[PDB]
Every structure is written in C-alpha cells, then in structure tokens.
Amino acid sequence: TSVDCTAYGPELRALAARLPRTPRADLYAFLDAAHTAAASLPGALATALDTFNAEGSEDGHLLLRGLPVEADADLPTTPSSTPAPEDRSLLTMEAMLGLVGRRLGLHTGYRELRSGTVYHDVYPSPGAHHLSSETSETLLEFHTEMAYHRLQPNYVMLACSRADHERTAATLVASVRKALPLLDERTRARLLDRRMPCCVDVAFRGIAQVKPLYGDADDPFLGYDRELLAPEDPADKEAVAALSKALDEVTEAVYLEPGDLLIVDNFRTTHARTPFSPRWDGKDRWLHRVYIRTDRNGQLSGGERAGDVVAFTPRG
Ligand SMILES: CC(=O)N[C@@H](CCCNC(=N)N)C(=O)O
Ligand SMILES: O=C(O)CCC(=O)C(=O)O
Ligand SMILES: [Fe+2]
C-alpha cells in the first residue's frame, strides 16, 4: 500500500527540526521527542499509519514515498562500517523513522545484533556473509525478521537515503494474506500453530521452534525464513514447500528510492532483496533500518521504552 507524502514535505521537515540533532547521544530523549512530535503528523498521514498499525493490509506493507531527504551532495559519504558514531548528526530519513516509528510503537535494539544499536545503516560490504543485509551481488532470500526470537518485532522499517546506482536492488515482500488462499486446507491445517525447528541469524549464534502460521485460522500470522526454517518431518517439509511456493507466487517488489520509508508488517510478511553491484565509491546504496514493537502477541511485558535493547530468547 503506498502513500505519496510529497505535499507534507514542509510540515515534515518542521517536525524533524523539533528533534535533538545527535540522536544516539541520548536516544531515549530523542525518541521521546519523536513521540511528542508524531502526534502532529499531518492528519491524513497519521490516519494511514494508524489504520495500517491496527489492521495491516492485504499486501503487508505501507510504503511512504516522497518524504523529505537531503540532496545527495548534502548526505555524508555512505558508511563503510558499523556501528555508527554516537555523535553522528541526525539525517532526515532517520528523523522520519523516529516520527513514523513512534506513531507505530517502540523502537527496539537487540543486544547481540549490531552491537545493540537501534538505528542500523544498511549498505553493501565486500565479502559479506550470505545471510547479511550487507550482501549485494547475491540475492538476500525471503525471511520474516527474527521469526525465531520471542521478542521478534511487529515491524521492520527501511528508509532510503541512497538507492544503488543503477536502481536494480528491489526489496521483495510476500504477504500471508495473499499467499494463504493458494494453500489447500490440509496444508494450512498442518502449518497452523505447528512448531518447527528453526536456526537463528549469525548474530544470535552461541535452537528455536517457529510456527509458520499462527493465530486466528482465518487471518493467520506468518513466520517464514527460506534459509533458517528447518522442518524434519516429511509432512512438515511438504507443507512448508507449498507455503514457500505460494509466497513466491504473490511476491511484490519495491524499488526504494531516496525519501522512501517502507513499513513491513513483520508478523504477516517475509521480505528479500535482489542483487546489485556496489561501486565502493562513497555513494553506494544506503538505507536506515529500525525495528518497532507494538502491543500485539507478547512483544511487551511492561515498562518498555522506545530505545530499549532486549536480549535473545528463542521461541520454543
Ligand atoms: C536479524 C538479522 O540478522 N538479519 C540479517 C538479514 C536477514 C538474514 N537472512 C535470513 N535470516 N534468512 C541482517 O544481516 O541484518
Ligand atoms: O536491502 C533491503 O532492501 C532489505 C534488507 C533486509 O532484509 C533488512 O535490512 O532486513
Ligand atoms: Fe530483513
């Protein structure tokens, strides 16, 4: 689902201006400022975000296009390392992630991942591990983010400061609401609420059980990872292969361009990124990623604040 935010440019640049300019130096204060400012998002934008937050969508994602972003010459050189300097000045797309993210829920860091940071730069790196968001020339296959984590976030948000030079990297999304009707009853029934073994991302290494479909049988949530989900039982493997095929069959593509902020419903979709060739010239593709927790399905137990970092516990 898309929303052209071009008309909101001046108002959004004003809200971004309310925020502290060095976010990481006091991230709790920065996200608190963003929450207060989010109450002033232009009405139509706020309504769209709240509706998506409460109901999701059939296609599983809300793409905000045309948000303010610096001219390319005014952005820093694309980062070459992580984590980012705590003193880094606020970038406009990061301000958008603060405002939009707080309208939805609570930004969350994961202790073992990216040094426990909350804002992650997503750029290509040479010799990237194949499961890494730093990949470029190899397809980053479909995954629900951290499907195996008890504190898996409801949303993954990706804001774009630079697209890759040739604009070939496509962010793919497949929605359970479009895939489900393609599955027969036997398959849906085998998958629903059935725990299956699942490996974890490199950062969390050193076993999990994931239900590929779960919750209300007429509108289930989805936990799928093409690389990590590892059913052993043949009936389970067969049901997961049918799910895998249906997700491919309903794949949708978003080509992120500067000023875009894509909100992925991480309990109802799986996402991926197609190949692209980095130039290592200082202008490589550069997204900003944050994870947002909401009141749904046990993400929060009380007292959480946007900016908190949580430890790893596998679903079981
Ligand atoms: C949470 C996390 O580690 N995510 C990875 C990217 C997803 C890895 N792919 C699969 N899980 N199949 C990253 O490098 O950011
Ligand atoms: O590069 C992309 O478009 C998405 C990468 C991704 O899966 C992620 O950052 O979680
Ligand atoms: Fe991802």
Curated annotation (Swiss-Prot):
Pathway: Antibiotic biosynthesis; clavulanate biosynthesis; clavulanate from D-glyceraldehyde 3-phosphate and L-arginine: step 3/8; Antibiotic biosynthesis; clavulanate biosynthesis; clavulanate from D-glyceraldehyde 3-phosphate and L-arginine: step 5/8; Antibiotic biosynthesis; clavulanate biosynthesis; clavulanate from D-glyceraldehyde 3-phosphate and L-arginine: step 6/8. The keyword Iron applies. One of its GO terms (molecular function) is clavaminate synthase activity. One of its GO terms (biological process) is clavulanic acid biosynthetic process. Binds 1 Fe(2+) ion per subunit. Its cofactor is Fe(2+). Keywords: Antibiotic biosynthesis, Iron, Metal-binding, Oxidoreductase. PANTHER family: GAMMA-BUTYROBETAINE HYDROXYLASE-RELATED (PTHR10696), TAUD_TFDA-LIKE DOMAIN-CONTAINING PROTEIN (PTHR10696:SF56). This is Clavaminate synthase 1. It comes from Streptomyces clavuligerus. The lineage of its organism: Bacteria, Bacillati, Actinomycetota, Actinomycetes, Kitasatosporales.
